[PDB]
Amino acid sequence: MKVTFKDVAGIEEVKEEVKEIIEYLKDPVKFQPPKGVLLYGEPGVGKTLLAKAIAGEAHVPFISVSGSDFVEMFVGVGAARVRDLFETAKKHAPCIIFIDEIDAVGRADEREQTLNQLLVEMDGFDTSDGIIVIAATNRPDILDPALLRPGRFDRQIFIPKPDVRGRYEILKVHARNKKLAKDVDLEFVARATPGFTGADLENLLNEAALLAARKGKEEITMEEIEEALDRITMGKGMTISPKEKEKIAIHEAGHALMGLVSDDDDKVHKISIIPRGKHIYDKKDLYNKILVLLGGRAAEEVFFGKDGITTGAENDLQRATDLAYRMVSMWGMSDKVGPIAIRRTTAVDTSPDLLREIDEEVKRIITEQYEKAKAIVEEYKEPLKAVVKKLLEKETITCEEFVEVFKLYGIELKDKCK
Amino acid sequence: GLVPRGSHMKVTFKDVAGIEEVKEEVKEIIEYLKDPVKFQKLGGRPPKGVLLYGEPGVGKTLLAKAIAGEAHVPFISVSGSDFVEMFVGVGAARVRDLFETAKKHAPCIIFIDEIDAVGRADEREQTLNQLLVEMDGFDTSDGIIVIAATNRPDILDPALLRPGRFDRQIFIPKPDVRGRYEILKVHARNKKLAKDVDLEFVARATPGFTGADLENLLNEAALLAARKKEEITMEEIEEALDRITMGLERKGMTISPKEKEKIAIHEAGHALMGLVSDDDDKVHKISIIPRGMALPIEDKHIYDKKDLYNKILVLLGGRAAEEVFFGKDGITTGAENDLQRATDLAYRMVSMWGMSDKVGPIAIRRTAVDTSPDLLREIDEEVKRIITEQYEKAKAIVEEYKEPLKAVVKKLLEKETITCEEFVEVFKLYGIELKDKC
Amino acid sequence: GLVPRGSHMKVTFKDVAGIEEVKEEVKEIIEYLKDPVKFQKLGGRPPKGVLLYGEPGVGKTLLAKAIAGEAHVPFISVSGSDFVEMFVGVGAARVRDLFETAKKHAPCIIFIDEIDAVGRADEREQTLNQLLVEMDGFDTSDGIIVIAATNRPDILDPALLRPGRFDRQIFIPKPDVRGRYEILKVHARNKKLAKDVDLEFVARATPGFTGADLENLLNEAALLAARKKEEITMEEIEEALDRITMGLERKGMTISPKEKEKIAIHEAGHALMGLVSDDDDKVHKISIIPRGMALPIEDKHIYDKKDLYNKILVLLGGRAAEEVFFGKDGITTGAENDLQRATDLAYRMVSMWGMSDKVGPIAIRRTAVDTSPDLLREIDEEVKRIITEQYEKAKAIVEEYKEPLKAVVKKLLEKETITCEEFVEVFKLYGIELKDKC
Amino acid sequence: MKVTFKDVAGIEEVKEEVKEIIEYLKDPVKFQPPKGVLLYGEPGVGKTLLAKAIAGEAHVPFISVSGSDFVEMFVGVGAARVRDLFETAKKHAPCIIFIDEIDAVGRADEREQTLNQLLVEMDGFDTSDGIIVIAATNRPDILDPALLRPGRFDRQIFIPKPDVRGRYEILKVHARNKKLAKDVDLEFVARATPGFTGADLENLLNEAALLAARKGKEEITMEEIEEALDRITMGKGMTISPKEKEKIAIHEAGHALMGLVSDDDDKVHKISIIPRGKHIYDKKDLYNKILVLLGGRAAEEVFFGKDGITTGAENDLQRATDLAYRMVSMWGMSDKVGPIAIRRTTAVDTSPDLLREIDEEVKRIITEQYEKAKAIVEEYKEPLKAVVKKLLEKETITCEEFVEVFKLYGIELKDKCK
């Protein structure tokens, strides 16, 4: 029932980020200031596991609760439950309140009261009390922004799906209890499970142990590992085909290329075939953000043609369009429309002609930037092929490695590496 | 100490008929119940809960009892409907008492019929919480298995299906003609019928029947014989069958032969599209028996325009076959579902994924943020273009292969279920080679 | 009798820096606390409650303590967050006990930090009611003053601001470069730094910092010196400043120099429009420091078409300056708010006030009572006409005065804040006379 | 803590109107029949003060409550609170129930139950019980009409902002407690605070006393009065500029002129530069009501041109348009549209062509009447200037004074004076 960082694998950056929280929990008054922390990511990537590991590293109790227990209760219950949860946590401090499925309470009627109670409690406890609240969710896109205001979950962390190195380390962690054979190559398993989560890998090793026992053996052999993987694939886990890997690699490479070419100030992050996940900007910065967002799809079209574009661009595309709309309907960055602003569902009833103008202008912006991105990808198609080769091999490369590959072709790129 | 005491079962796989696949699926559970320590020897965690869902009378409880008997372990049965009167009130037991009584008799099976009675979306809530607590907490390592059963899986509290508690579901389908035949044989053992009857005819004559219905037919025939002379004859079977089938045709859904033909053509069109497409998934078995129940883009992570076009094609295959075989006046409402999905998919391609050239790479997350009528008109025109293009393609494909499809439809109306491989063979007998997607 | 006992404060206006206007505003309260009977000699009722709001670390609690020390009166402090554990439960005090303890020590100050903890829009409700009852009921004539503080004034229960209870609010803004310099001086007294440092550079290098941040910087420098030799040098200050500024730039909003230039141009355009308009209100000071927080036609009773046109002009001034200085690609999202208001205003002029000739004197109270598309088209066309007309006018005005505006922007990026009079002087140095609206 | 009519100033008409209620409260059975009374007006005009004065004149207790205390309560509380309020009032009868912010409960979900409870209680108590319910509100335009049905608040009274005479009398009332100097001219203060409310005047005298004390004096002098007024104006109270006064005077004069010229039966009220605030009609009566409503704006345009029209017409204009709509969509008073009736949000989905016809016809009606009003104002521009001069001087004149000024120009006007 004890958990520590030894049981978590493949997220060294997150461990570094939460080292401060662990130091705080070990001795709060000495440290003093994070209040709340949000963990978001697909199911089975280790959010609850990470919270429990943080709790165990500081040798503090771990209070686990779900939004589901608060959401469905009769009228007036959920708020008193939140308040009593915080009081019981205060009494056992120092401790951690873990709230899984925080989206169940924090969407953007009765749930509203419970949400407000949560906000009150988050703001009320001083740092002297010695509590840290960790929330977890699969749906960060539908969260009430109030939850992220300073003092309330003012620090968010993404837990990504594991790459090959992460998958290998996870397989090591979960192999420890099981008595595997010498022949098994967990590295091969890692390279054979792109798109798996830590939970998927646990289930794979467990099914392999089950099949081994069913065959009366005493050691788990590559036979059973491959059998379990084939079982799951043939009809829980979803694996990425090599063709899919190539498509994703090209999309992400186009994204990074646009990031590294645009006349912007945003820093380009690492390139990986794992899916990705309040300031002032000017018209040009926004055009270039759109460009970056359209880069992956532009690469898809340049390499595979109009019939090869994929759903992987979905997110990106939406954001791009959304941005264009804000540029036209909220920020008056269109000449044809002018410096008029309507949207905040809008507030005033708009005529159809004006909506048609807004739509036409959004299409103009998006298609212009899309042609720009397609042209850029065409110009640098060969260094991009090089990057994609390195990417399909290692599954992930650094922005610095991207720049290096590109200068190998006599191309100097902007120093935007994060 | 109010919970019923567990008892062994006098039922085994010999008493179940027509679901060999389900038997394969539960072989793992039976091996575990025969020897838990062997399973856990390598720290391999086994399954805790298992949900059986299917129409009433298809053999869910029978399957649970048969599993219990194959391992020679006790079988503790309780009904979800009884839970409130069982585990709520002064003097009444608690759910924990059920699980502990099972632990003492371990290895054994706890069977919960009508689990939906407690786990839909009050006191029943208290009982449900007790059950969930026990499922998450209780150390099942001793070798007990919880099997839940329900006829209404569409109204199950998703909390019941979270990992660790009933995280494994199994569908028990209605028996096809061979399955009905085997069930009739199984229940004939006790009745000792007369010589003249050939049960295969009874099977072929009862599409859409469940094992329970065949039981009731044979028992009514034996009763009529007793009321009539030591021997059960075709006369009495035909009388009982006419009675039950007439009584059921009104309330309920019976498979008319015309309905059977329509269904066969629809499913054959689906399968044909699946087997002709360039880049698709693997084709499953073809059958006029419903293939599941509640509890279309999730087989892969990303899809490309071609994969989505081909998915649309498949979805339109059934209607295309209907039109080719029966003409524009013979298309049916059975395609309803399919059609919707197809159209829905097309919409996503145009308004969400920017896979239309005319529309462009614009994306509208969904539902709509005040869109001009011109844009909606463009989206609709493009959706209609895609759908009609794929529909003409599918109609052409069916036209090309109309004769081998007629062959498949005949084999299907006969056997009620065929394999993808049999499909390929029927097609090879017409000098037509199909891709090995089976 | 659980409430904390009141104690005098060792803080006065000498310890507060960079908010001389707030000091003027609270001079009345300090005079009252020095001698209540003098105030009430002519039956002049004084203020009861005072709300201080501003970003965290700008000196709200410091200001309250300084007011308490200037009058030499006790200072009773309590946190809103503590109220529930303070005034709720068996044995716990009551809010009345706080107010009466203050009355006995009168004249004094009750300071309630984080008043938002109790007064947002349960037991906290009970405590809030107790506080309100005391605010309305208690005879403060003895000379006690309640000062509330909050960082989140946008979520305050408006009941807290009704007349008689916290009916007076004061904003404490972030310090400009001069204010930061004075704060650094204040906190230098205790630290005795080395000779080489010129704190003015540190001030200029810390836009958007609060007094607390400057405190933390100087204390970290003194700590590093101790860990390093009796003297604090530029080396250690630069190290600490780099540390804190790097750590803050990520989470939070820091003022880049480009951001500072954009903000300066925006605010300068606002002020220029204000100073050029024919019939407007008086122009306030120009500064790149935010000028308020939550808790555009209310300065007069009635407005005419010209006044509204000029208000629109002002609202569009910032964006017009942005475009003139940076071109169509340099306009920014900072104008967002402004733009909305402008457009909103135009709409009211057309659909609510009948100030359009093309539309006529028709009025649609708001939102809409089934209006034909033709009418919405006319309203939109007229709104666009108004907004673009005023925007071209504003762009022309900025073009005409681009050089003196560059001068103002330079002075602004230097000092971070300037007066309307300094604006007029900068403009007079270019042979341009502006109206005396200061 | 005692209040009477001596503490209220500048509303003799309201005191006359409530004399009957005071007689009722002094001896209810002898009198017998008003049940409820609504006071509406801008904040700080003395609604609560008037209620307390009524309570004190009859020597009866005064039960004060706010809608705000009823509105926010958990489900099922507000109705039991209303019922218990009426029971406690019945026990202490004769008394007054005063409900401030009656709009908080009486708008047009859970609040609905409390509102119904209020209605039940209003209807249930007979006149024998001896209670009077006085409601107060700033937003009479959003009140549920059920509150005004006979037997429930069947008498409404508007409390207007004080004119110069009212402001002077209020300054007298509030000066009594303060020890002013001989030099102070409260009449000058009155003429210097157009658009002030009684509360604004109280605050002015109080700030003046504060400044006097701060300067160590013993008497409040014009210095302090002017200083306090300058303080409030320079950065609580809103004063009307003389240009604003001229605009308002012209608007109100146009209103009155239309009232006195139209072929109607409605009576014209007094003319004042203070803002203003179930029968059968025929098409002509409605056209003339529209005309009157458009008179103020028409005068504004005639005197100051298209760039001088003001927001003061807002109310008027809206009503006019609303009326036109009812004439076209509800009463079939348009030939082009016909005797069709749709609106009661309408009930049946209407085609766009018909909505365009309705809008075009409404515009026709409004513009016709607006040209009519502009022409009338042009014809009588000089007598109107005379009225405006008298109005800027006295701030208020009677309809009879209006007619007199006009006959001084050889113009006989209809005897519509109220």
Ligand SMILES: Nc1ncnc2c1ncn2[C@@H]1O[C@H](COP(=O)(O)OP(=O)(O)O)[C@@H](O)[C@H]1O
């Ligand atoms: N990064 C990881 N490292 C080690 N184990 C993991 C990781 N991710 C998932 N797991 C395993 O998968 C299972 C699910 O983890 P959990 O944290 O509950 O998922 P989530 O928090 O995303 O709901 C756990 O049993 C855990 O051991």
Ligand SMILES: Nc1ncnc2c1ncn2[C@@H]1O[C@H](COP(=O)(O)OP(=O)(O)O)[C@@H](O)[C@H]1O
């Ligand atoms: N597939 C089958 N094979 C053999 N017998 C069956 C089958 N399905 C149903 N039966 C018979 O029908 C009866 C009903 O089975 P049961 O499992 O109780 O129904 P359900 O699972 O729908 O509640 C049993 O007596 C059983 O012997």
Ligand SMILES: Nc1ncnc2c1ncn2[C@@H]1O[C@H](COP(=O)(O)OP(=O)(O)O)[C@@H](O)[C@H]1O
């Ligand atoms: N304007 C200022 N002048 C001098 N010192 C300041 C100023 N603002 C903040 N400080 C210092 O920063 C610290 C925080 O002040 P405090 O009033 O507690 O913050 P807040 O009011 O935001 O809660 C105090 O120790 C104070 O000395």
Ligand SMILES: Nc1ncnc2c1ncn2[C@@H]1O[C@H](COP(=O)(O)OP(=O)(O)O)[C@@H](O)[C@H]1O
């Ligand atoms: N007509 C008036 N005569 C005398 N005093 C007035 C008048 N109007 C307002 N006041 C003063 O203004 C303050 C607010 O009065 P109140 O009746 O509470 O306003 P309302 O009823 O409009 O909310 C009171 O203290 C009162 O003395």
Ligand SMILES: [Zn+2]
């Ligand atoms: Zn992308």
Ligand SMILES: [Zn+2]
């Ligand atoms: Zn189908």
Ligand SMILES: [Zn+2]
């Ligand atoms: Zn602005």
Ligand SMILES: [Zn+2]
């Ligand atoms: Zn008017």
